[PDB]
Amino acid sequence: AITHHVKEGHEKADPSQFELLKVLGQGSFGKVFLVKKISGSDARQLYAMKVLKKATLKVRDRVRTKMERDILVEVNHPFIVKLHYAFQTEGKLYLILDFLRGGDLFTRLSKEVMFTEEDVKFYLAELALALDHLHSLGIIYRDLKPENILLDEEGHIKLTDFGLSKESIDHEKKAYSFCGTVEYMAPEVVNRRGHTQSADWWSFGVLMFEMLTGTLPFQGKDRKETMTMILKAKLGMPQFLSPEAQSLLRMLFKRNPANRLGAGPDGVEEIKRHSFFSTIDWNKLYRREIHPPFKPTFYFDP
Numbered sequence: 001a002i003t004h005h006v007k008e009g010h011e012k013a014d015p016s017q018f019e020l021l022k023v024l025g026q027g028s029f030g031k032v033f034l035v036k037k038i039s040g041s042d043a044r045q046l047y048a049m050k051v052l053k054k055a056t057l058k059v060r061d062r063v064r065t066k067m068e069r070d071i072l073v074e075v076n077h078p079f080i081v082k083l084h085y086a087f088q089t090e091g092k093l094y095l096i097l098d099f100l101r102g103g104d105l106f107t108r109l110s111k112e113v114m115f116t117e118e119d120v121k122f123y124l125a126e127l128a129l130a131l132d133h134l135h136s137l138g139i140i141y142r143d144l145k146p147e148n149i150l151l152d153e154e155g156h157i158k159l160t161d162f163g164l165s166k167e168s169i170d171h172e173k174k175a176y177s178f179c180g181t182v183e184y185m186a187p188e189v190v191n192r193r194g195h196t197q198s199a200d201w202w203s204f205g206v207l208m209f210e211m212l213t214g215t216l217p218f219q220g221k222d223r224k225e226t227m228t229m230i231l232k233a234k235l236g237m238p239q240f241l242s243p244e245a246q247s248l249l250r251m252l253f254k255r256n257p258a259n260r261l262g263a264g265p266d267g268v269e270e271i272k273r274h275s276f277f278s279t280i281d282w283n284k285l286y287r288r289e290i291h292p293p294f295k296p297t298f299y300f301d302p
């Protein structure tokens with residue numbers, strides 16, 4: 001067949017269609033900005049714009065930005081951020097995502113020091129459904145940390161940053177990269193022996209421990225000491241934690257990933273049916289029908 005030398009025409013989304021309002025923070029590979037759509041059907045809509053600079057030279061950040069885009073296009077879940085646009089210019093990549101009005105969980109955690117078990121149960125329950133959705137698509141999230149847990153105006157969670165995630169992890173395939181925040185890494189991630197979706201359940205345990213106590217379970221004076229402390233996994237259990245919380249933590253903190261809660265044949269069901277989550281109606285939770293525990297004039301002349 002002879003090639004028809006003609007070009008398809010399309011009106012392309014450009015960064016000029018989004019008014020820059022302020023810098024929201026720093027994502028895995030670039031800055032995130034609050035922007036407002038100028039034109040089209042979604043005019044006046046607020047979004048979060050993630051920008052990757054000098055994209056042509058930053059080859060590893062570029063391949064992961066493309067993977068992040070691909071993950072976001074594939075996912076359809078209540079607790080996972082929606083991607084609205086993805087486009088590029090010379091040396092710049094852009095992702096236009098939902099703007100989460102409630103800020104991140106780290107800001108709330110730092111202000112409160114620690115959360116009640118009722119609050120932790122809520123956050124982890126929505127997170128377990130989001131993680132399981134990613135696992136069903138062959139994805140390892142890998143970058144759990146409270147900075148990556150965003151809240152909407154209602155107080156429900158959203159996972160938003162997939163820059164450090166891993167795709168195509170199914171059957172006997174393992175990932176070997178050493179990326180993410182060290183304090184949340186599973187032992188198999190730290191010792192470079194290969195990791196799968198079960199590494200996310202160790203991270204889920206770290207996040208749980210931090211939310212309940214205000215501190216990290218395995219941490220040393222520097223990143224190298226934290227690494228060897230994760231490999232030893234000698235956990236000092238705070239005595240204000242309930243028996244249900246202590247059971248879940250010990251079942252998640254299994255150094256052998258094959259023996260970790262959520263790694264058995266029932267997958268996420270092993271976590272969903274744990275006593276710590278016994279008051280959770282998982283169907284109502286997925287339907288966003290569970291009230292979040294936290295939701296993020298003087299003149300008088302009658």
Ligand SMILES: COc1cc(Nc2nc3cccc(-c4c(F)cccc4OC)c3o2)cc(OC)c1OC
Pocket residue numbers: 024025026027032033048081097098099100101102103104147148149150160161
């Ligand atoms: C990180 O701090 C804030 C973030 C938001 N909202 C928000 N929606 C987002 C959608 C995608 C990404 C981010 C994000 C970000 F904006 C900065 C750093 C990391 C991020 O995600 C892990 C998002 O952040 C909203 C805020 O206040 C209303 C924040 O406090 C300044």
